[PDB]
Write a protein that binds this ligand. Sequence first.
Ligand SMILES: [Zn+2]
Ligand SMILES: [Zn+2]
Lengths: 547, 242
Amino acid sequence: AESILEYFRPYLGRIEIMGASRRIERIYFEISETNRAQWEMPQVKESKRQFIFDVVNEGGEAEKMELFVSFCEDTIFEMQIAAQISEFWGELEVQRVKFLNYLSRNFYTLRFLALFLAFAINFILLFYKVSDSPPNMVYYFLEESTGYMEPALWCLSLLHTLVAFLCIIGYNCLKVPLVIFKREKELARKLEFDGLYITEQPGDDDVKGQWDRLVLNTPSFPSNYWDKFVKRKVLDKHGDIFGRERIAELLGMDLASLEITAHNERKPDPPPGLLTWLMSIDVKYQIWKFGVIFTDNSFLYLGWYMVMSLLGHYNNFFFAAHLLDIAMGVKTLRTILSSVTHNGKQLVMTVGLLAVVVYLYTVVAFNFFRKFYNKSEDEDEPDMKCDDMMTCYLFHMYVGVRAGGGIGDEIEDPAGDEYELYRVVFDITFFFFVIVILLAIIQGLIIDAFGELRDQQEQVKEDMETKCFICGIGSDYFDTTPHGFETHTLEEHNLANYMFFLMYLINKDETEHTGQESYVWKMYQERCWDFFPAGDCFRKQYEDQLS
Amino acid sequence: MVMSLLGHYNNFFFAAHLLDIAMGVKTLRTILSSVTHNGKQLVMTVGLLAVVVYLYTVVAFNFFRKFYNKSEDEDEPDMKCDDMMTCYLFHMYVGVRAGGGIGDEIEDPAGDEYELYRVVFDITFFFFVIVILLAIIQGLIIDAFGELRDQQEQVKEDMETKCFICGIGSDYFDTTPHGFETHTLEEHNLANYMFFLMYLINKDETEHTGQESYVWKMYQERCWDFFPAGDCFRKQYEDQLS
Ligand SMILES: [Zn+2]
Ligand SMILES: [Zn+2]
């Protein structure tokens, strides 16, 4: 039967679990070709790199399984969205569905096209010129030899604005549902397992905690999330202790209504008119969704991009502000800017501390030494800079710091004066403190940011090349047999296999669950995360009889 | 060869051959590897330096352009920021190379309505394109040196730690005196494997013994299974002391 095994090899998945008994057990299941292809999709496989990075660096080990399960949930939701978007009234609805699907599929190409249009529209502006006469006081106009440049500028500006609008629409169509799903999933988790609203209330520092109270009474709370009985479970858990009717009012549900609907309920005909649709819209839920979507970092950046695109029609040079997109338009540019943003608070406080020592030098140079700060070569009038404390402080900061030699090369030399030694000490201390000492800090901070980033990358690589992710057993034990660690990492315990098993359990019906699948499902509903093999494997369980 | 031929047309073309010392000295290429390695980041940093200067040029072109006159005589002016091309060239060519920044080249803003704006402009220019955008350049090459040294020491440690063929650590062999050295020079030796492969290739097929025939027929199929992976003679016969 070799041929059948070769045919069904990609579709057969195996998983090791702790099991009901004290022995590690192995489960075989089916993997769909569509799911396998979506997993082999480059971005889905790219998300694993980031998940691994955030669990290895700045990540615990006791909560590692919970984080892995949350990552699996997010990946399943993204796969569902990708499957959804793959490939009079009814006519307009169908056309708009195709339009939204097209935007969702081609979201990134719109971003790249916007970058290209910004570069072209900024190249065109390099030919601009100021004149006194018309082509009143100033007559800024584009001077060029080859014609068809102003019409090109106008058309490119219009096209850039249109592409920016399409980018906003595509982002709102494709990326927002994941954010909403995560927010609602977390809210349901802490509502049913911690009772943050039943027991006590969210703290005043939790602005999102206060904002989450809006969807408690809405009839669309479990939307954009797998579970729709979270309110029922919360009621059944907290009613006996905090008052069943109180919890029902808090969650906006009617126990009598649900009971009578369970007994027998009449189904009214759905009216499709806009008049009834208006109140079919859940205003409070939409308000909460808008509140949680307007705080997104990416959405605010896209809104700023759109605002700048609109302002570009008022004045063309505003389009130059779009060049900054290359900071987040190139993968490696953001990596080299991470060495500046990371460890940047220290940079801010160092540049703030630089403003204090200059103040001390200003006070010293204001009580005395202020006859040297004259800057007028003619005797007609003086141009003293240290007569006031504000002017002297401005002079030292603006001119003294930027000077290569320090403060000594700007003011009158102290030769042949009573305060020659004091001025020499003053200048030398200034040069050795605010030039060679307070800039080495700035350089060292960023150099060490680079070094620490490299150390983090190599640490992640070593950790993943050293020991197993699930069991935690080192590779030395598995390396007794040839290619033991690789065989273990690709066949025995595989993250893709665990994700596929979770998706299979979610998809398949409850009545079709076998004993082991039922056990895993009922343990999964309670966030136990105990069925995962921790510190044990099938080979270790059956070292004798050679497994 | 082409440069040598062109040297007869004009002698100074021979100067182009001095660059051969880059690849004519062993250590010169090692110290140039710290610049070539991690050099894409250098190219993109110097490209990004050309964008912030463009932004400063736009800001200094819409206004602040009365300070860019460079003619000391009143006979004629020599404005540099009247055009967007000339102003961008001035900032890149002269502003970046200046030690103090852009503030030491243009007219001082003292006694003017835009004094504070010009001070902010100059200070931001100096703190962004001088002390920040050059520390990146220096740090990249310094870290290239450091990473090269780390690679060398990692290779040394890996070869001094465990066996190349078996992969067994030196701790197991060190039970007997000089066990790891004896294993690396006698039990499994890369030179011995190369010599055996050459001997099998050279000798006739009809003269192969059983073991040589087995190794040869396994070698023709790219199996690479006859190599001892995770096992050795001492581990196979720990009892009876091999
Ligand atoms: Zn494992
Ligand atoms: Zn060996």
